[PDB]
Design an enzyme around this catalytic site. Structure first.
Site, PDB file in Angstrom:
ATOM      1  N   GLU A  69       0.806  -1.223   0.000  1.00 35.78           N
ATOM      2  CA  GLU A  69       0.000   0.000   0.000  1.00 35.78           C
ATOM      3  C   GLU A  69       0.844   1.281   0.000  1.00 35.78           C
ATOM      4  O   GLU A  69       0.830   2.078   0.948  1.00 35.78           O
ATOM      5  CB  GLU A  69      -1.017  -0.050   1.151  1.00 35.78           C
ATOM      6  CG  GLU A  69      -1.990  -1.230   0.991  1.00 35.78           C
ATOM      7  CD  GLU A  69      -2.974  -1.410   2.144  1.00 35.78           C
ATOM      8  OE1 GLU A  69      -2.551  -1.428   3.325  1.00 35.78           O
ATOM      9  OE2 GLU A  69      -4.179  -1.577   1.854  1.00 35.78           O
ATOM     10  N   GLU A 145      -4.124 -10.355  -0.491  1.00 38.53           N
ATOM     11  CA  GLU A 145      -5.086 -10.329   0.615  1.00 38.53           C
ATOM     12  C   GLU A 145      -6.493 -10.622   0.109  1.00 38.53           C
ATOM     13  O   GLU A 145      -6.927 -10.061  -0.900  1.00 38.53           O
ATOM     14  CB  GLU A 145      -5.064  -8.973   1.330  1.00 38.53           C
ATOM     15  CG  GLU A 145      -3.715  -8.624   1.945  1.00 38.53           C
ATOM     16  CD  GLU A 145      -3.609  -7.189   2.422  1.00 38.53           C
ATOM     17  OE1 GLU A 145      -4.648  -6.578   2.732  1.00 38.53           O
ATOM     18  OE2 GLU A 145      -2.469  -6.675   2.496  1.00 38.53           O
ATOM     19  N   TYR A 146      -7.202 -11.506   0.807  1.00 36.94           N
ATOM     20  CA  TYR A 146      -8.598 -11.804   0.476  1.00 36.94           C
ATOM     21  C   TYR A 146      -9.302 -12.412   1.686  1.00 36.94           C
ATOM     22  O   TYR A 146      -8.643 -12.825   2.644  1.00 36.94           O
ATOM     23  CB  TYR A 146      -8.687 -12.729  -0.762  1.00 36.94           C
ATOM     24  CG  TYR A 146      -8.510 -14.206  -0.478  1.00 36.94           C
ATOM     25  CD1 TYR A 146      -9.577 -15.097  -0.639  1.00 36.94           C
ATOM     26  CD2 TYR A 146      -7.276 -14.721  -0.058  1.00 36.94           C
ATOM     27  CE1 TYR A 146      -9.430 -16.451  -0.377  1.00 36.94           C
ATOM     28  CE2 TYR A 146      -7.120 -16.084   0.204  1.00 36.94           C
ATOM     29  CZ  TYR A 146      -8.197 -16.941   0.042  1.00 36.94           C
ATOM     30  OH  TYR A 146      -8.051 -18.287   0.308  1.00 36.94           O
ATOM     31  N   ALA A 147     -10.634 -12.454   1.648  1.00 35.91           N
ATOM     32  CA  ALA A 147     -11.438 -13.030   2.732  1.00 35.91           C
ATOM     33  C   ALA A 147     -11.077 -12.431   4.097  1.00 35.91           C
ATOM     34  O   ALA A 147     -10.551 -13.112   4.984  1.00 35.91           O
ATOM     35  CB  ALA A 147     -11.330 -14.554   2.751  1.00 35.91           C
ATOM     36  N   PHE A 209     -10.750  -2.655  14.025  1.00 34.45           N
ATOM     37  CA  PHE A 209     -10.141  -3.021  12.742  1.00 34.45           C
ATOM     38  C   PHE A 209      -8.783  -3.717  12.856  1.00 34.45           C
ATOM     39  O   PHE A 209      -8.297  -4.288  11.881  1.00 34.45           O
ATOM     40  CB  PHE A 209     -10.091  -1.834  11.776  1.00 34.45           C
ATOM     41  CG  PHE A 209     -11.333  -1.692  10.946  1.00 34.45           C
ATOM     42  CD1 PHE A 209     -12.343  -0.817  11.329  1.00 34.45           C
ATOM     43  CD2 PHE A 209     -11.503  -2.455   9.789  1.00 34.45           C
ATOM     44  CE1 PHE A 209     -13.508  -0.695  10.569  1.00 34.45           C
ATOM     45  CE2 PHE A 209     -12.664  -2.342   9.020  1.00 34.45           C
ATOM     46  CZ  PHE A 209     -13.667  -1.460   9.410  1.00 34.45           C
TER      47      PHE A 209
HETATM   48 NA    NA Z   1      -6.862  -4.420   9.994  1.00 36.40          NA
END
Ligand code: NA
Ligand code: NA
Ligand code: NA
Ligand code: NA
Lengths: 211, 211
Positions: A69, A145-147, A209
Site C-alpha cells: 500500500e 489479501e482476500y477473505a 479493525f
Molecule cells: Na486491519
C-alpha cells in the site's frame, strides 16, 4: 521482514513464504507521493536491498514483495528491476497502484471478488476470473489479501476456492489474516481482557479493525 | 457459401458475415479421417479457394471459415495458411478439433457453457470464461454455435450476454439457429402440416432435430 527464526522454521516445517520489504506509505495523498519521489529512493532501496541480502538463502522464501500500500511509483520499478537483476530465482510481486503494474510478476490484488467487478477509478478491482483474461494479460493471479476475517466473517470463502480450483491461472491467495491484534488489559480486579484501538487513550484510532 | 444475393443484401442492409467453406465430414470416424488425409486436400482446397475467389470483395464478409465439424487435420492448417496469404484482411476461424487449434484466429467453440466445464477427452468444451485465460491463450472467443433453440428453449440465454458484456475478450456468438428446417406435407383434405425427420419414409433419420 520477519524475525530471522521465522524463515528457518518455514524452511524446516515447509511453508511457502512471501518476504516483503518494510515499506508502507498508505497514509500519503496520493498513495505514491513518496514512492514516486526520487528523493525517497535511497531510503526505499535500503529496505528492499537489505532484505534480499539477508533472506535470499532461505528456500522457504519463494517470492519477493516490494512492500505494501504505497501506490505505484518509479522507485518501485527501479527496485523491481534491481531484485530481478540480483536474484532471478524468485518472482517479484507488488500490489500497489492496481495490482497489475510493471512492478509485479504476479497479479496480486487485495480483496478482488470472484465474480463481481469493482471498477474504481484508476485502481479497479476486477472480478478475479475477469482480470486474468483482460486484453494482453498473461500473468498468474494470487491475491495478496482476500477473505477479510474480521469478527464473524469468511462468508463466501467457498466461492474463492471453487474459482481457484477451476482456473489454472488463479493460483490462490493469502487470507487476511492469521491473528487478532488484540492486547491484554486488566480491570480493577486484575482480571485480563482483550483490548483494541482506542482502549489505551489512543486517538485518532481505528477501533476493532486491528482484529 | 450462400446464394450470391445473400452477400449483396448483407452489404446493403448491414450484417457481419462469416463465410464458410462447404466442408463437413461429421459422420467420419474419427471426425478428421478425411481432413488429415492428403488425398482429400485437393477436394478440400477447391471448396476453400473458390469461395474466397468468389466472395472476397464483399465488405459484409468479415471472417472466413474453413467449414464445420470435420475434426482437425493437416489439410485445415494448409488451407488456413492459404487464406492468410491471399487475403490478410479477414481473420480465419474453424471450430473443429477443439475450437482453439492452430487453424483458427478465434476461439470459436460450439455449445461451450458460461460457467460449467465439459471436460471431454481430447476436445474439451471449457467454460467460456475459463477458456480465455487458459495458460498461454490470448485469442478472442466468439461462439460459432450456442443457445440451441430447439423447441421450447433458450433457457439461460441471459447468462451468456451477462458474460459477453463483462469480459472484453468474450465477443459474442452465433445462436443455433435462425429457422426451423421443417417441410410442408399435406393431409387428405389438402391441409398443410409441418414435417420433420422420418415423415417422408426417410430412415435412418434424426426426427425433430432439424427444427
Ligand atoms: Na486491519
Ligand atoms: Na488454479
Ligand atoms: Na465482451
Ligand atoms: Na439440427
Amino acid at each position: 521482514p520477519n524475525h530471522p527464526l521465522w524463515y528457518t522454521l518455514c524452511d524446516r516445517y515447509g511453508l511457502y513464504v512471501v518476504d516483503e520489504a518494510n515499506i508502507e506509505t498508505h497514509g500519503m495523498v496520493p498513495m505514491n507521493r513518496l514512492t514516486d519521489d526520487p528523493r525517497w529512493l535511497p531510503a526505499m532501496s535500503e529496505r528492499v536491498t537489505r532484505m534480499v541480502q539477508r533472506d535470499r538463502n532461505h528456500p522457504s522464501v519463494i517470492i519477493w514483495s516490494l512492500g505494501n500500500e504505497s501506490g505505484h511509483g518509479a522507485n518501485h520499478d527501479a527496485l523491481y528491476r534491481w531484485i530481478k537483476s540480483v536474484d532471478p530465482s524468485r518472482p517479484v510481486q507488488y500490489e500497489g497502484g492496481g495490482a497489475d503494474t510493471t512492478a509485479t510478476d504476479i497479479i496480486c490484488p487485495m480483496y478482488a471478488r470472484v465474480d463481481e467487478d469493482q471498477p474504481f477509478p484508476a485502481v479497479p478491482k476486477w472480478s478475479i476470473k475477469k482480470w486474468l483474461s483482460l486484453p494482453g494479460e498473461t500473468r498468474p493471479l494470487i491475491l495478496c489479501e482476500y477473505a477479510h476475517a474480521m469478527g464473524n466473517s469468511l462468508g463466501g470463502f467457498a466461492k474463492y476456492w471453487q474459482a481457484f480450483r477451476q482456473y489454472p491461472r488463479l493460483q490462490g491467495g493469502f487470507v487476511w489474516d492469521w491473528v487478532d491484534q488484540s492486547l491484554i488489559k486488566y480491570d480493577e480486579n486484575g482480571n485480563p481482557w482483550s483490548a483494541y484501538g482506542g482502549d489505551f487513550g489512543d486517538t485518532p484510532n481505528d477501533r476493532q479493525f486491528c482484529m
